[PDB]
Amino acid sequence: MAMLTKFESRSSRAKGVAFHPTQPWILTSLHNGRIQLWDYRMGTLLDRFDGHDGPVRGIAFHPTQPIFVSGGDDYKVNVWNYKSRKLLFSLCGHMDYVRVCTFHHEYPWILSCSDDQTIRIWNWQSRNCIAILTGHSHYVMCAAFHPSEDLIVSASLDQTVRVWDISGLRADAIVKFVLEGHDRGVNWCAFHPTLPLILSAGDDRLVKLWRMTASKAWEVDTCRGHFNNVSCCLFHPHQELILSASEDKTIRVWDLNRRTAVQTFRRANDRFWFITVHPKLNLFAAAHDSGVMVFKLE
């Protein structure tokens, strides 16, 4: 498998990247607190957004509205309009670093999670927190909405992945499954677009695959090969492949069915912090210690 890099920014450490679903843009959020908006077809910086002190780890566009959300070490979840370029409002509630923030695909909700050991769901019309999901015993490093069902999945340094039932919201927001398996903290978790599969990545240097049904969830298999903390992982949406990204300075591609290594891509000096896939193109982006890259595979 070959990597074809289409865009690269040279900057201080980047922590988050988000693809716009129809414009050729990415947002990048940096460890220095700044947010950039780049056109990856022209290769040019379009806008800068400054509304945080310290690192900004969470960043996401709304899937249809001209909004994006950012989440910071200053505990704020900020909502912005990219046409007016204004910071619209700041959602107050978290009491420690925000690790991830995303929009729901249908409801007017934002999800965020935090070192304060909570996941929060916010309604961006009323500007209120509508649920606080508690139960993790350490930082919650990641949370994601299920692509169709009223479920959330989260990953924590308490070494667990949890799946939450939020149908009551839509107790009420309650843990459905507590997935034990990682023997170290978990840094990331992700749902497959269509199948009942979860992927998680941890400080044990492993990527694990899990399967769920209505009544139960269990560990399927493990991708072994990273030699440092795995920061992020995702399902390739158009091939039976798993992608992972690690502080060992590699992006790895694995076979979804066999869990065997397919390809490794390596940078000489840069730890990887985050990877994402475009919602409608076969385009990927990674954030690392020296900026961001957008790339195709094969």
């Binding site: 692509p147 677009p193 949406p237 919602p279 409608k280």
Partner: peptide, 11 residues
């Protein structure tokens, strides 16, 4: 089940 699969791939 996700937006692109439902709008583009399937119908």
């Amino acid at each position: 089940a996700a937006s692109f699969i439902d709008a583009k791939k399937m119908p």
